[PDB]
């Protein structure tokens, strides 16, 4: 099965279904900042 | 609401890209709905070009979506987001701290309270330090303790503050087993440097894609009800190109393409926070008359005697094995015109 390793910079979206809204948006460069 | 979806998403990504310029190669985290919702509230009290600038800055075209439809749509958004759903904590609302001597219009106060989830507090801004503390503690309460110290400084001539808050807490549809979390695993922060983070691990069926155009992996993780997370992992060296591509169009393409199948998934457990001073950014984006000596907030107070002076946002995020908690708040400050 394919591996997905989130071990470098990534963008994140948190979405709500009923309104199709972006609740939060970001980029994680350093998760321990 | 569907049209509002694409427009609000594209505002989110345009503001995101402003932040990648202001704080380059740094963590970014914000609630675009919180910022959009605050500014639309402010626009309910605005008239003529002051009003049109705000909604045009938010991405609306007044030929396609007239001002009253924008207003209606955001009122419907805020209602829907707050409608109770089992296994999801999601609150979004607003507070208006209004100077004890201002003369707000019955219409504006009735609009915000009844149709926009707003609490109204008569505030004595002659005690600025006490008002700042009051406002920060209210936001801290409304965010379940998560957004502390929203307002670092208030201008001494402040006469009104508008705050929007959002709080979200949800469980993963497929939680991680903490016995499979690796206590210290490497996360690459730049080409030659790693940091140690706890790395969660699960092999599960997830919707996922490799975008063959944008050179990135996209991984969908659902919350148990009414919400999902998207993780966008660019190929090495490709973050800027992915950032430039992100749009409503991209999201609609992913919505079609993602396919559910087995994935051996590693995700960090972590917390981050971010703060933004938005006054100058919003001016650059097109909100100009609101700051001016000729601001038109005729719909807000009898004497139209206020202008916007400052704007700021703070947002926080935690991801772990059970799910996600996130919160945000947006502050708009006004002074005598
Ligand atoms: C797999 O990629 C996506 C992308 C966006 C999505 C979704 C899934 C789902 C979940 C789903 O539809 O299955 C929702 C609810 N999304 C949105 O909120 C959304 C927001 C703005 C726009 Cl412009 C388009 C869609
Ligand atoms: Ca949105
Ligand atoms: Ca599982
Ligand atoms: Cl959206
Ligand atoms: Cl949004
Ligand atoms: Na007045
Ligand atoms: Na008071």
UniProtKB/Swiss-Prot annotation, chain A:
Expressed by the liver and secreted in plasma. Thyroxine binds at residue 17. It is found in: Secreted. Belongs to the serpin family. Major thyroid hormone transport protein in serum. This is Thyroxine-binding globulin.
């Amino acid at each position: 099965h394919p591996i997905i390793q989130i071990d470098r910079s990534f963008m994140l979206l948190i979405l709500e279904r009923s309104t199709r809204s972006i609740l939060f948006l970001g980029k994680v460069v350093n998760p321990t900042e | 609401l569907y049209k509002m979806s694409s427009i609000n998403a594209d505002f989110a990504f345009n503001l995101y890209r402003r932040f990648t310029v202001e704080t380059p190669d740094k963590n970014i985290f914000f609630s675009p709905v919180s910022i959009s919702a605050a500014l639309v509230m402010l626009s309910f009290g605005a008239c003529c070009s002051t009003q049109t600038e705000i909604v045009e800055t938010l991405g609306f075209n007044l030929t396609d979506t007239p001002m009253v439809e924008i207003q209606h749509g955001f009122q419907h958004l805020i209602c829907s987001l707050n409608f109770p759903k089992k296994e999801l904590e999601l609150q979004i609302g607003n507070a208006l701290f209004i100077g004890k001597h201002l003369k707000p219009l019955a219409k504006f106060l009735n609009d915000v309270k009844t149709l926009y989830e707003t609490e109204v507090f008569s505030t004595d801004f002659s005690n600025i330090s006490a008002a700042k503390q009051e406002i920060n503690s209210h936001v801290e309460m409304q965010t379940k303790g998560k957004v502390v110290g929203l307002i670092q400084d208030l201008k001494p001539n402040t006469i009104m503050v508008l705050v929007n808050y959002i709080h979200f807490k949800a469980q993963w549809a497929n939680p991680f087993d903490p016995s499979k979390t690796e206590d210290s695993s490497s996360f690459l922060i730049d080409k030659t440097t790693t940091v140690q983070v706890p790395m969660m691990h699960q092999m599960e069926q997830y919707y996922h894609l490799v975008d063959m155009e944008l050179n990135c992996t996209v991984l969908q993780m659902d919350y148990s009800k009414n919400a999902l997370a998207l993780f966008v992992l660019p190929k090495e060296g490709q973050m800027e190109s992915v950032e430039a591509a992100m749009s409503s169009k991209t999201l609609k393409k992913w919505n079609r393409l993602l396919q559910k199948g087995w994935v051996d998934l590693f995700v960090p457990k972590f917390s981050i926070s971010a703060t933004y001073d938005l006054g100058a950014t919003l001016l650059k984006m097109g909100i100009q008359h609101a700051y001016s000596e000729n601001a038109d907030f005729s719909g807000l107070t009898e004497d139209n005697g206020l202008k916007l002076s400052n704007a700021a946002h703070k947002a926080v995020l935690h991801i772990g094995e059970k799910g996600t908690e996130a919160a945000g708040a947006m502050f708009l400050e006004a002074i005598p015109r």
